[PDB]
Amino acid sequence: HHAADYVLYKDATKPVEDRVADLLGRMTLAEKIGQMTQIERLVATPDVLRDNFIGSLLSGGGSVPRKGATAKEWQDMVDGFQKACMSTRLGIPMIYGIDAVHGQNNVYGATIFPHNVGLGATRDPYLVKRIGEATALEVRATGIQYAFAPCIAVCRDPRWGRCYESYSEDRRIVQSMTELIPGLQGDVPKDFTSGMPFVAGKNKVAACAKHFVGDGGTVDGINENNTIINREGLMNIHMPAYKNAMDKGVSTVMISYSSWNGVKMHANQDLVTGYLKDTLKFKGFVISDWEGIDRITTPAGSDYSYSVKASILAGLDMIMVPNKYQQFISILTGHVNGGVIPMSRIDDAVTRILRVKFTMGLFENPYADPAMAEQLGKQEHRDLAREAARKSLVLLKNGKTSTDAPLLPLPKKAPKILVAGSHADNLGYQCGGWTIEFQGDTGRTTVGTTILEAVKAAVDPSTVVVFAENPDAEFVKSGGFSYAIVAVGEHPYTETKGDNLNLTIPEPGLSTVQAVCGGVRCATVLISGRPVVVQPLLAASDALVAAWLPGSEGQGVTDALFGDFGFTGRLPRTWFKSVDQLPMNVGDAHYDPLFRLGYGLTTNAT
Numbered sequence: 001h002h003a004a005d006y007v008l009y010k011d012a013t014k015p016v017e018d019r020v021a022d023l024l025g026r027m028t029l030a031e032k033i034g035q036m037t038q039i040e041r042l043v044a045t046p047d048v049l050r051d052n053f054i055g056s057l058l059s060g061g062g063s064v065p066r067k068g069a070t071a072k073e074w075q076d077m078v079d080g081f082q083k084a085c086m087s088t089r090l091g092i093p094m095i096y097g098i099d100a101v102h103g104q105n106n107v108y109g110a111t112i113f114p115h116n117v118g119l120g121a122t123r124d125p126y127l128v129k130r131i132g133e134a135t136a137l138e139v140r141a142t143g144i145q146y147a148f149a150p151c152i153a154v155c156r157d158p159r160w161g162r163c164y165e166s167y168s169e170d171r172r173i174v175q176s177m178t179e180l181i182p183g184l185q186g187d188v189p190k191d192f193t194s195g196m197p198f199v200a201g202k203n204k205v206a207a208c209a210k211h212f213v214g215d216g217g218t219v220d221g222i223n224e225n226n227t228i229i230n231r232e233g234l235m236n237i238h239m240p241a242y243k244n245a246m247d248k249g250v251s252t253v254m255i256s257y258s259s260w261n262g263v264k265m266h267a268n269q270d271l272v273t274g275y276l277k278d279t280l281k282f283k284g285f286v287i288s289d290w291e292g293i294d295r296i297t298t299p300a301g302s303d304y305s306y307s308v309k310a311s312i313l314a315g316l317d318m319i320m321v322p323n324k325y326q327q328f329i330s331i332l333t334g335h336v337n338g339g340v341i342p343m344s345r346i347d348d349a350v351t352r353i354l355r356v357k358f359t360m361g362l363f364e365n366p367y368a369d370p371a372m373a374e375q376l377g378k379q380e381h382r383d384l385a386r387e388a389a390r391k392s393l394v395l396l397k398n399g400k401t402s403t404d405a406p407l408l409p410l411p412k413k414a415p416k417i418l419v420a421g422s423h424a425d426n427l428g429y430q431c432g433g434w435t436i437e438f439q440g441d442t443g444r445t446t447v448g449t450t451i452l453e454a455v456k457a458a459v460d461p462s463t464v465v466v467f468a469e470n471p472d473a474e475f476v477k478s479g480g481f482s483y484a485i486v487a488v489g490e491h492p493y494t495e496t497k498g499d500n501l502n503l504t505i506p507e508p509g510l511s512t513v514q515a516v517c518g519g520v521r522c523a524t525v526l527i528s529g530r531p532v533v534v535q536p537l538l539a540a541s542d543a544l545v546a547a548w549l550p551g552s553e554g555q556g557v558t559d560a561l562f563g564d565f566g567f568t569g570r571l572p573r574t575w576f577k578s579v580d581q582l583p584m585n586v587g588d589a590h591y592d593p594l595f596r597l598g599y600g601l602t603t604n605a606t
């Protein structure tokens with residue numbers, strides 16, 4: 001259509017499938033393999049990107065241009081990489097991915113939403129959709145086009161370090177929370193075929209349903225381990241939400257480290273090609289996890305040639321290398337040159353990668369929009385996170401006996417109150433893992449309101465607020481306090497570091513709750529990524545709230561404590577009596593919970 005030097009794949013008016021086909025037919029082997037290669041920003045340079053025809057970059061957890069970097073610094077970084085890719089012969093833009101899994105969480109000043117287990121407690125798919133919308137804007141604020149979310153693991157054992165990344169042990173809650181997908185990407189159009197990738201445009205991002213499949217089902221919740229369940233249980237528990245993801249046009253799927261009955265997902269042709277592609281009709285791209293291919297072997301990385309062969313023949317399209325791109329490209333090129341991997345496979349992989357890039361408008365807007373920078377940490381997004389935090393909270397106890405006055409909601413006016421505990425004035429702890437750093441961190445890591453700060457912003461100006469992290473019993477008894485709010489729980493963790501067989505909170509936690517509640521009526525706020533041993537906390541406390549990992553907006557906690565809204569959260573997991581019972585999920589034969597899935601006390605707004 002019309003000029004001397006017309007190249008159909010560059011024509012924005014043409015159908016995506018014709019663009020894909022036109023570009024693919026022009027590409028060399030090196031240009032194809034390049035598309036299939038995702039590298040860390042930490043090993044990327046202009047020359048590396050250009051000479052290897054690199055298709056994608058990511059920031060892994062904590063991989064940032066520098067500490068405290070502004071939205072514009074992020075855009076400049078991404079643009080700098082993109083300029084190199086757009087200068088190749090074919091000018092195929094790279095897509096940049098990041099784990100924006102509760103906001104754009106690696107970024108200083110990004111709104112930090114509650115983690116997924118709290119979101120499950122909300123039972124509010126529309127809220128999650130809205131969080132998807134806001135997240136897309138904050139990810140685009142930083143120039144990034146692709147979020148490795150949602151995690152749709154159905155966590156079947158809370159000893160897993162990633163249980164907080166699952167919305168529920170009940171697949172139906174997980175399925176309902178796939179509304180994150182059209183949040184992040186835009187609603188699919190009315191026609192729409194299930195399994196087609198979709199992204200509305202430059203104000204949205206490509207999503208990623210992960211980690212396919214049964215990541216939530218590993219033995220003793222060991223991270224990356226074996227999931228021993230039969231096809232019926234796979235299909236009934238761990239699969240359904242992937243089908244909802246297909247219907248909502250999720251653009252990519254990330255493969256699990258885990259194995260299904262001794263077969264490594266990263267080598268499972270029957271599930272990746274047979275099921276995801278050929279039965280669910282997924283037409284987006286399938287990405288590996290980080291060194292997921294290396295982990296096919298034991299030790300990991302010990303026969304990387306076999307790792308490339310097995311993964312690529314299994315039907316993986318893009319490999320998150322992420323560092324040793326030269327070895328990956330060399331080996332894969334060898335396999336293709338040797339006839340071990342047919343061109344038809346390469347062409348399928350690249351066809352899917354390009355389909356997503358074209359569909360989302362990446363060839364029309366490869367560069368960042370500086371006007372979107374102000375989306376980062378935008379106050380409306382914070383008000384949304386604050387709403388979500390509040391809705392996430394599950395009230396487990398409100399009075400030690402049935403005839404006690406309920407403690408919550410607390411009055412905003414009182415002569416003097418105590419705020420205590422390790423988790424009362426620690427933003428990093430209240431955000432938990434995947435915040436600023438991979439494993440999360442302690443202290444004031446980003447912009448936010450701690451519980452203490454929230455309490456001070458909420459109360460009557462005549463209320464004197466005292467903070468003591470770990471006061472002794474006497475201090476409390478002598479203080480003249482009307483009540484205390486005490487906040488304790490788990491430290492931040494991510495992935496294998498949080499695999500935990502005992503599930504008890506670190507001390508001082510319990511000892512502080514005991515010393516405070518022994519002296520004055522107390523509301524205990526429990527910060528955790530999962531159910532933890534809670535009977536001793538409960539026995540000491542007048543009221544106790546499971547606040548999960550509520551994120552940057554700690555006023556979501558005080559909104560419910562002071563009665564501006566009523567508690568509405570409901571457990572999205574079974575609260576066990578003992579780790580010796582685990583796994584123990586709703587619907588099991590021996591089902592003996594401390595608190596069943598669905599439990600939650602309520603209050604009315606005052």
Ligand SMILES: CO[C@@H]1O[C@H](CO)[C@@H](O)[C@H](O)[C@H]1S[C@@H]1O[C@H](CO)[C@@H](O)[C@H](O)[C@H]1O
Nearest residue numbers: 059060061062099148210211289290438495
């Ligand atoms: C963020 O990368 C993590 O890095 C450490 C080392 O830096 C690896 O040991 C971990 O296995 C990965 S976890 C993996 O990371 C993907 C990219 O961030 C993420 O999307 C996925 O959900 C994780 O399983």
